[PDB]
Amino acid sequence: GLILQSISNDVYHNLAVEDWIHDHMNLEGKPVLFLWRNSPTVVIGRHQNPWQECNLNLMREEGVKLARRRSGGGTVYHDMGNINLTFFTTKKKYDRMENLKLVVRALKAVHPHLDVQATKRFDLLLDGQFKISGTASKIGRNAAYHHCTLLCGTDGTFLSSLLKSPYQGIRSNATASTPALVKNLMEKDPTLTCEVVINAVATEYATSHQIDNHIHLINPTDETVFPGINSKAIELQTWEWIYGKTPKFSVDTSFTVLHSHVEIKVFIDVKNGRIEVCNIEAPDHWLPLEICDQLNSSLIGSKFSPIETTVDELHSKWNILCEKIKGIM
Ligand SMILES: Nc1ncnc2c1ncn2[C@@H]1O[C@H](COP(=O)(O)OC(=O)CCCC[C@@H]2CCSS2)[C@@H](O)[C@H]1O
Ligand SMILES: [Mg+2]
Numbered sequence: 001g002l003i004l005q006s007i008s009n010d011v012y013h014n015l016a017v018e019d020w021i022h023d024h025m026n027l028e029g030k031p032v033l034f035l036w037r038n039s040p041t042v043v044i045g046r047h048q049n050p051w052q053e054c055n056l057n058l059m060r061e062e063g064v065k066l067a068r069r070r071s072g073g074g075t076v077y078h079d080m081g082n083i084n085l086t087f088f089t090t091k092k093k094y095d096r097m098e099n100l101k102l103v104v105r106a107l108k109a110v111h112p113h114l115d116v117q118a119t120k121r122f123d124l125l126l127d128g129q130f131k132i133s134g135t136a137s138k139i140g141r142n143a144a145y146h147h148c149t150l151l152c153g154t155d156g157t158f159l160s161s162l163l164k165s166p167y168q169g170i171r172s173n174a175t176a177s178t179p180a181l182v183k184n185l186m187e188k189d190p191t192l193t194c195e196v197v198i199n200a201v202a203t204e205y206a207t208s209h210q211i212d213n214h215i216h217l218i219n220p221t222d223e224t225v226f227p228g229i230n231s232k233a234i235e236l237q238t239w240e241w242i243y244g245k246t247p248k249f250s251v252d253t254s255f256t257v258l259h260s261h262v263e264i265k266v267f268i269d270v271k272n273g274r275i276e277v278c279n280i281e282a283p284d285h286w287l288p289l290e291i292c293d294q295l296n297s298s299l300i301g302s303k304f305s306p307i308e309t310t311v312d313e314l315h316s317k318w319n320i321l322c323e324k325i326k327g328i329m
Contacts, residue, residue, distance in 0.1 A: 001209035003202050004218050006036040011067045011078065013220035014038060016232035018086055019070070022143045024226075027090050033205045034086040035198055035215070038078040041065040042162055045073040045136065049174035049246050051167045051304075057327070059162060060306075068242050071136035071147065074177030077162055081153030081184065083194050085201065087146045094144035096122050096135060103133070103150070106204035110196055111189050122148070123180070130183035150201075152194045153186045167328060169253030169266075174246065239303065244273035255324045257317075262286045264321065266328065270304045280325065287317050295321070304329055 006014050014036045021032060042054045042064060050056060050066055053075040059066060078084065087099045100118040107114050115127050122135035137146040159182065185192035198215075206213035220229060235241055251268040262283055269277035278299040282292050291314065302308055306329040309322065 001205070001211040002030060002032045003205055003211075003215050004032060004034045005198070005202075005215045006034070006220055007217050008220045009037055009039040009080065010220075010233075011038040011041045011043065011065055012237045013229070013233045014084070015067065015069060015236050016229050017218070017220045017226070018138075018145060018147070019232045019236075020226050020229050021086075021088050022138070022140050022145060025088065025143070027088055027093075027143050031093065031209065032086075032088040033202070034088065035202065036084045036086070037080055037082065037194060038084070039065070039080065041067055041078040042075060043067050043069055043078055044075045045175055045177075046070055046245070047072055047175040047247060048075060048177070049170070049172050049249055050075075050243065051246075051249075051329075052165055052170050052172060052174060053177055054163055055161065055166055056329075057166070062162075064162060066242055067236070068245060069136065069147075071138040071145075072175065073136035074134065074175070075163060076134055076149055077154065077159040078149070079154055079158075081151070081155065081186075081194060083150035083152060083197060083201075085148050085150065089144050089146075090142075091139060091144045094137070094139070094146065096137060096146045099146050100124060100133075100135070100148070102204055102208055103148070103201060105208075106200040107185070107192075107197070109204060110200045111192060114188070121178075124148075124150075126183050126185070126188060129181060131180040132183060132185060150197060151182060151184050152192055152197055153184055156182055156184060156187075169251050170249055171252065172247060172249035174249065239273070239305070243303070243305070246270070246273050251328065253328060257286075257320050257324070259286060264324065266325070268299075268304075273304055275299045275302050275304055280321070282321065287314070287321070291318070299325075 044050050044053050117125050124133035126132045132151045133148050135148045202215050248271045253266045265281040267279040278296045306326045309326050
């Protein structure tokens, strides 16, 4: 076996490590535990819709990153109070429940008789009620990996707010997340910091696999240790990967503009993250049909993105309309 810990807090490089080990490491008789922490990041599953899963506006104005991982499943929040664990094995040795049991041992080592259980859907629940860990996994040609979270000191009130989407009128068959009551380990026992739990998990893994209790710190940007890793990190951070992989969806919504008032109806089909069909319908007593048709036509093929939409009475109405549209992206 082998225990690695990333020195980086950049989700995209840390995910690239997963890709890399998956692609390049011989895991036969040598499983790998990989420990990592990210800066503030919402991580959606492979087949998810981020407009459906999080408050993107609040994320942008707080500097919270969005990443899409290669495994399926739901949406979680990562910050420095959260530990990520990746158990790499051969496909034959893929065993999610074995890994979760190992984590339970580790937690009990630093807090004897901690009430943490693993459920059938691979969550870890604290005191039979509160989610402290969620699981996903990926199978490849040469390897399997199981990764999970571990909430030690994560901003729980901030977590809940970032994962509450304000986007209305979305019709999609993208993968849904499963909301849960969560808790931190440090809420139960203030000694269970990330550092303490990381060490506890490494120690347990070392004993379980009969290897030296040594964490090898690794640099996920090092092309000499990990040839080709920076191209993986680039791909993972492309708009095409993060947003463009979103399953087909439609938006059917409206908003009101002061004038009394005027209601504008918005019908937008979004495919591959790009505006495939666009019909913004303003009352022709407020804005000429040709002007709305201009706006609809210019949006076609454009990215469903609040950036790629910015670029006397009518000009003022246009701006109000553009800003409302920006606000749903
Ligand atoms: N960090 C973290 N840990 C545990 N639970 C969380 C977290 N963030 C949010 N949640 C709660 O879980 C649900 C989502 O649960 P759901 O079951 O829908 O999704 C998951 O658990 C997926 C886990 C993915 C783990 C990967 C590991 C390396 S990269 S991300 C969310 O609505 C909140 O209630
Ligand atoms: Mg789970």
